[PDB]
């Protein structure tokens, strides 16, 4: 449930707000019951011709003034206590939530993603804040007033309520089928559209290939296709809902028809009084269209429940391994033993691949063992599974031979300390930085163990020696200063087991020896299993190890390994956009807006029309000198019918036409944004802000909010304005006195709403600041989770958050108070205005100035009119929402990328010469521009050769290709394509002429046959020519078994095909494009050696004639590869 987070006084805030909202609502119907006392008595005065006239009139006045004070107190106790309970619930939601996220496992952390987390937290919450803030208040008031029409009709005159009641159920059916068909459609619409979304997700999911083969366009059309079906049923549901509302109003009007004629009979029976009836009309009118004019508030609550859903999914959760409980044993006497056990473990993200498949190790307390070999063999997969980040799927790890699952982890991850693989820092001082060892470290406890890594010169050197700031990832340091604070930092825990893992690799070997030997003699009783760098600093371990593919069979001491011929004898050898640009994105479809607005003025001004209906009704009702009822009022029952059918047509029109305007804009802009994105350079997506999920939300939610402005603004604001204005006209017309005075409220409500909107936007601003501060904290852990668990210092982060979060808390307090104040002002002055002008108009009559019935028309025009400002400024928050979203997608539009993918001018080389040449090409990636890529590169291939490459693990071994396909402009050097340099190229041709094997080439939300066919757009390459290239890839002889030949929709990133198959295809994805320059980076990885060669085999008598660069770090087909380049920090060797 939403409210499930509420203390007692929370609930007292609520219930007092809700009963006072009931009284807020019951205000104006009872104002009409006294309308009726007044109408009866004073129409009998007017028609009959009462010198108490002024007396009685001011009496009724002070009655309405009493109700003025009544609605005042009601309004602001409503808003005060509603927003206050909302805010206290908000902060409690946030505390227990953020608690839960720090509590939910790392697994769950690699199934969701960070910016998606933080964005969920912030916007989810703020959504819930306005959801349950005060909207619920307006809604309970607005249903109160319509529901008070019920009893008021019955108590005042029990005649016409009979008939109108007796019509109510059939309207029950009207709105029944309303919700039935709206729900049916929109559910089918989402259940479909979510596919149009997932195809965007999977296409933007590997922008690499989607650019690496120009195949932008096939995917733009895939989008527009699923968007086609959804947009189709768009206008359909628009119809159904507007059909429904038109039915609703047809039936209200013909119901008033029955009522008016039936009760005409009654009043002409000289029975009861014009008061009872004419009220039972009026008191049953306001309530009804009001509770009608309630769509946005139930919109709000809908959004809010949808929000709170997944948040409570997060909160109520619980893992099998917990971070906040004494869930088991927690012993004192421990010798730092640790022994793996038949570990068969795999990720909860990349589940299918298993990394450790049975490892029978042995470590004792005090004795250190060395962890070395080749990369990927299991070092990090060894370190993570010890502090039980990822619950071993089938493996187990035990200290002293018992269940570490029963070792209370708040004790486990606090007794052992693994100085991180890559030293991560925080936006702290060096003091607090190390303090994250435990937290209570006196200055000496700091300095003494600080010096144990020589951190005393560059720390005692700075102005504010220690108290100067370690920056962003240590941005006020680098490796020569950073990796020192770490290896002594978590030391201050005095770990019962320290563990080293490539943790001293970024300085001079002096500091390395300091941290190594100062932690060689410091581990007198604690072991330290070492993943090291050098082949003599691996040896400071009583036993050395060998990492072999999930089986521990070879390991031991110095004289225990080198003589064994395993690995150890092998090893040593927001520029704001305008009102106009938003309003101009929808320019083609003007007539839909002209239609929407004309029908809007009709729908709106139709109410003071009802003032005139009922006003000339009063007079005709008065005398009855003839058989008036069935002779005239039959006509009026008709007019009600005519306005009923006119309302059906005008409603259905304005609603439907804005529905179709909404569809129009959404399809258009979704498509344009998707295209724009897929065009841009590669250097946009290789970032951390502009990710995949960030982008999917950007697209969907941003087009949605671009419509939310106009596609619902004109209609609602327009009902309101032409309504106020139609009453305005009427009032000015009859007696030009009462408008002005009853418009003496326009300055109060005007400047009040204005100061409230300005100081409420100011609230939004101070809030963005305060939660932006708070979210700095948030994001810190939310990103660095790998460490904030391992230091077991997440709970202080909890508390530091909470104290910051107090920020938008007191903000909310100010917000509740200023908002309550303003809207109390508004309501109370509306009522006070009725009373005062009412009064003055009494004596106006006692001139004769206005025929009474005219005053009642005037007052009644007003009392109808203003009932349209209920949420007239409630759709303002969504407008600034849209305006922001607009400036965002416009940053996404006009950005003229450096290297355009649609090269219009330049050279479109109609022939290919495979001569690429490098000479001293230097390059650095954009993300974190400290470290470089190359130390000057110079290489080249001729036609048909094989420039093979082999080296260590990840030393500039990816960036080979990405400089040739013109992703990036390599900083300073020579890169060209056969004399005519690349910068002359038409990258379209160039990109469609090369060939790449992706590092992990995905498949799409597509069949078997287009995936391959993808490789050549600008022309549909035919069905057959695949089977050759699919047999030349030795992948068609497999399609033998697949159920459909070529209609397998291999689900989101290859669901029905394994990776090896999703690699065994990779080659076929281009071959028909005729890639004359093969750039194979990790050509064949996931196959079997008999067929794994057919990647190259099937090519052996065909790779020739067309140049290439083949890079697959193996032995059987590099030893027959021509040219070699050794990767030594980015050179050619």
């Amino acid at each position: 449930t939403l409210f499930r987070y509420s203390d007692w006084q929370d609930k007292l805030f609520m219930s007092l707000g809700t009963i006072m909202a009931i009284a807020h609502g019951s205000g104006l119907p009872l104002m009409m019951i006294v309308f009726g006392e007044m109408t009866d008595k004073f129409v009998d005065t007017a028609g009959n011709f009462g010198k108490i006239l002024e007396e009685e009139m001011t009496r009724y006045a002070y009655y309405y003034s009493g109700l003025g004070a009544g609605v005042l107190v009601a309004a602001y106790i409503q808003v005060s206590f509603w927003t206050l309970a909302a805010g206290r619930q908000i902060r409690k939601i946030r505390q227990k939530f953020f608690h839960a996220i720090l509590r939910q496992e790392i697994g769950w952390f690699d199934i969701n993603d960070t910016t998606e987390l933080n964005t969920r937290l912030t916007d989810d919450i703020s959504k819930i804040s306005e959801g349950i803030g005060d909207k619920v208040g307006m809604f309970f008031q607005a249903v109160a007033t319509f529901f008070a029409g019920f009893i008021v009709g019955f108590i005042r005159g029990w005649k016409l309520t009979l008939v109108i009641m007796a019509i109510s159920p059939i309207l029950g059916l009207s709105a029944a089928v309303w919700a039935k068909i709206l729900s049916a459609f929109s559910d089918k619409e989402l259940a479909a559209y979510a596919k149009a979304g997932a195809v965007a997700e999977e296409a933007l999911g590997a922008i690499r290939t989607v650019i690496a083969f120009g195949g932008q366009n096939k995917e733009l059309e895939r989008y527009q296709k699923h968007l086609e079906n959804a947009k189709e049923i768009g206008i359909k549901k628009a119809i159904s809902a507007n059909i429904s509302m038109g039915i609703a109003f047809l039936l209200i009007y013909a119901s008033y028809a029955l009522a008016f004629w039936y009760g005409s009979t009654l009043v002409i029976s000289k029975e009861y009084t014009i008061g009872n009836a004419m009220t039972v009309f009026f008191s049953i009118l306001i309530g009804a269209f009001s509770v009608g004019q309630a769509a946005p508030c139930i919109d709000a609550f809908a959004n809010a429940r949808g929000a709170a859903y997944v948040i409570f999914d997060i909160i109520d959760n619980n893992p099998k391994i917990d971070s906040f409980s004494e869930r088991g044993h927690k012993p004192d006497s421990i010798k730092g033993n640790l022994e793996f056990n038949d570990v068969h473990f795999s990720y909860p993200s990349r589940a299918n691949v298993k990394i450790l498949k049975g490892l029978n190790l042995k470590v004792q307390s005090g004795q250190t063992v060395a962890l070395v070999g080749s990369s990927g063999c299991g070092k990090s997969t060894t370190v993570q599974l010890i502090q039980r980040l990822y619950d071993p799927d089938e493996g187990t790890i035990n200290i002293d031979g018992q269940d570490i699952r029963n070792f209370n982890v708040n004790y486990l991850r606090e007794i052992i300390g693994v100085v991180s693989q890559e030293p991560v820092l925080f936006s702290t001082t060096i003091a607090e930085n190390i303090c994250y060892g435990r937290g209570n470290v006196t200055m000496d406890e700091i300095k003494k163990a600080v010096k144990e890594a020589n951190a005393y010169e560059f720390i005692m050197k700075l102005p504010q020696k220690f108290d100067t700031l370690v920056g962003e990832r240590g941005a006020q340091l680098s490796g020569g200063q950073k990796q020192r604070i770490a290896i002594a930092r978590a030391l201050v825990r005095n770990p019962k087991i320290l563990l080293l893992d490539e943790a001293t690799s970024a300085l001079d070997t002096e500091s390395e020896a300091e941290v190594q030997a100062a932690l060689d003699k410091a581990r007198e009783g604690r072991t330290t299993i070492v993943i090291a760098h050098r082949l003599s600093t691996v040896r400071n371990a009583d036993v050395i190890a060998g990492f072999e593919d999930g089986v521990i069979v070879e390991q031991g001491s110095h004289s225990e390994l080198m003589k064994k011929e395993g690995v150890y004898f092998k090893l040593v050898n927001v520029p704001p956009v305008s009102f106009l640009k938003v309003l101009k994105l929808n320019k083609t479809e003007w007539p839909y807006f002209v239609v929407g607005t004309v029908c809007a003025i009709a729908n709106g001004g139709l109410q003071p029309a009802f003032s005139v209906i009922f006003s000339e009704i009063i007079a005709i009702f008065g005398p009855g000198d003839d058989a008036v009822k069935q002779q005239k009022c039959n006509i009026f029952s008709l007019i009600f019918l005519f306005l009923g059918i006119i309302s059906f047509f005008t409603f259905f029109l304005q609603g439907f036409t804005f529905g179709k305007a909404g569809e129009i804009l959404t399809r258009r802009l979704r498509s344009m944004a998707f295209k724009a994105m897929l065009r841009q350079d590669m250097s946009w997506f290789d970032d951390h802000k502009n990710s995949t999920g960030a982008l999917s939300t950007r697209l969907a939610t941003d087009a949605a909010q671009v419509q939310g402005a106009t596609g619902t603004r004109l209609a609602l604001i327009a009902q309101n304005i032409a309504n106020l204005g139609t009453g305005i006209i009427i009032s000015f017309i009859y007696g030009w006195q009462l408008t002005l005075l009853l418009l003496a409220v326009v300055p109060i409500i005007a400047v009040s709403g204005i100061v409230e909107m300005k100081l409420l936007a100011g609230n939004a601003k101070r809030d963005k600041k305060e939660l932006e501060a708070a979210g700095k904290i948030a994001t810190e852990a939310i990103e660095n989770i790998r460490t904030v668990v391992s230091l077991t210092q997440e709970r202080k982060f909890e508390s530091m958050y909470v104290e910051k979060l107090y920020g938008p808390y007191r903000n909310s307090v100010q917000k509740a108070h200023i908002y309550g104040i303003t809207f109390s002002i508004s309501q109370a002055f509306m009522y006070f205005s009725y009373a005062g002008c009412f009064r003055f108009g009494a004596y106006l009559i006692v001139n004769g100035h206005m025929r009474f019935r005219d005053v009642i028309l005037v007052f009644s025009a007003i009392v109808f009119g203003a009932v349209a400002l209920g949420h007239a400024s409630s759709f303002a928050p969504d407008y600034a929402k849209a305006k922001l979203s607009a400036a965002h997608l416009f940053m996404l539009f006009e950005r003229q990328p450096l290297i355009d993918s649609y090269s219009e001018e330049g050279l479109k080389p109609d022939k290919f010469e495979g001569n690429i040449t490098f000479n001293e090409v230097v390059f650095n990636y954009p993300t974190r521009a400290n470290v470089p890529v190359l130390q000057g590169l110079s290489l080249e291939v001729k036609k048909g050769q094989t420039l093979a490459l082999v080296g260590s693990s990840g030393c500039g071994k990816s960036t080979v290709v990405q400089l040739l396909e013109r992703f990036y402009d390599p900083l300073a050097g020579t890169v060209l394509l056969d004399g005519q340099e690349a910068k002359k190229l038409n990258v379209q041709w160039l990109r469609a002429q090369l060939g790449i094997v992706s590092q992990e080439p995905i498949l799409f939300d597509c069949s078997i046959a287009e995936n391959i066919a993808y490789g050549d757009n600008s022309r549909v390459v035919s069905q057959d020519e695949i089977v050759s290239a699919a047999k030349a890839a030795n992948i068609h002889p497999f399609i033998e078994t697949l159920p459909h030949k070529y209609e397998t929709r291999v689900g989101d990133k290859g669901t029905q095909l394994s990776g090896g198959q999703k690699q065994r295809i990779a080659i076929a994805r281009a071959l028909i494009r005729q890639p004359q320059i093969l750039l194979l980076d990790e050509a064949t990885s996931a196959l079997d050696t008999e067929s794994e060669k057919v990647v190259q085999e099937a090519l052996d008598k065909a790779r020739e004639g067309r140049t290439c660069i083949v890079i697959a770090h193996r032995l059987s087909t590099i030893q027959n590869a021509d040219l070699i380049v050794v990767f030594q920090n980015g050179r050619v060797k």
């Epitope: 004192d332 708040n410 004790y411 606090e414 937290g439 209570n440 709970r795 202080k796 508390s799 104290e803």
Partner: antibody, heavy 126, light 104 residues
Framework: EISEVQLVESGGGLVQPGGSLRLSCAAS????????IHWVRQAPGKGLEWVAS????????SYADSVKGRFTISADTSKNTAYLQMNSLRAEDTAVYYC????????????????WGQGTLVTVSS | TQSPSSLSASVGDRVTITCRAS??????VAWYQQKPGKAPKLLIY???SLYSGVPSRFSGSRSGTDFTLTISSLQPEDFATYYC?????????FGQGTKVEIKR
């Protein structure tokens, strides 16, 4: 408090067997969630003697057996002060009252008495 | 509570002030060198560790039910009262300690 002791004075005075006090040990240099404030009794001519234990993290409450029942410790993480109300004043309740500190986010300590304040000497007389 | 191993004699002994456990708990006692008229100061925790501000003369460990503080080499620099505080229960008992000095 991480470089000093900031448990500051609160509630110093004299008591008669018809008196009482709302004694306090206003912690500082940290915030209550980081600790579990403790008091003890320094009875003259004997060792130290514990009275109670509150931890505003969980709101726990463990009293001694003599001052049991008639007392209360009520800390407020908002205002950062522990609050032991000595009511029902008989004679031997007089002493100097070392009000202490603790780290609760380092379970290895296993001695919630890491810091110590001087103590508000409470004196019954005649 | 502990048994008073209050030693104050001529120079040259390894006084290991012993502390018996009032009951059977998990091994947690904290020791102090209180000066009668002063406020206690932490020396060791966990009955085995070493807090800050301490010179490397104070030390302790467990021996079953035996919580010890080891101070050797009777000097002209040994005078205080000591204190045990038992732990590992919702309530805590104590030890009264000893009283060391120099014996000419």
């Amino acid at each position: 408090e991480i470089s000093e002791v900031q448990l500051v004075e609160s509630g110093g005075g004299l008591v008669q067997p018809g008196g009482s006090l709302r004694l306090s040990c206003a912690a500082s240099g940290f915030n209550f969630s980081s600790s579990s404030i403790h008091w003890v009794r320094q009875a003259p001519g004997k060792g130290l003697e514990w009275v109670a234990s509150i931890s505003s993290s969980s709101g726990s409450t463990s009293y001694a057996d003599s001052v049991k029942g008639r007392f209360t410790i009520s800390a407020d993480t908002s205002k950062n002060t522990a609050y032991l109300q000595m009511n029902s004043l008989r004679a031997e309740d007089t002493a100097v009252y070392y009000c202490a500190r603790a780290y609760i986010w380092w379970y290895q300590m296993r001695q919630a008495m890491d810091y110590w304040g001087q103590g508000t000497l409470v004196t019954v007389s005649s | 509570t502990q048994s008073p191993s209050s030693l104050s004699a001529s120079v040259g002994d390894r006084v290991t002030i012993t502390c018996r456990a009032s009951q059977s708990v998990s091994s947690a006692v904290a020791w102090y060198q209180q000066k009668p008229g002063k406020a206690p100061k932490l020396l060791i925790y966990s009955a085995s560790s070493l807090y800050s501000g301490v010179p490397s003369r104070f030390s302790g460990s467990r021996s079953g039910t035996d919580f010890t503080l080891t101070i050797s080499s009777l000097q002209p620099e040994d005078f205080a009262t000591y204190y045990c505080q038992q732990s590992s229960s919702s309530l805590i008992t104590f030890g009264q300690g000893t009283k060391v000095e120099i014996k000419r």
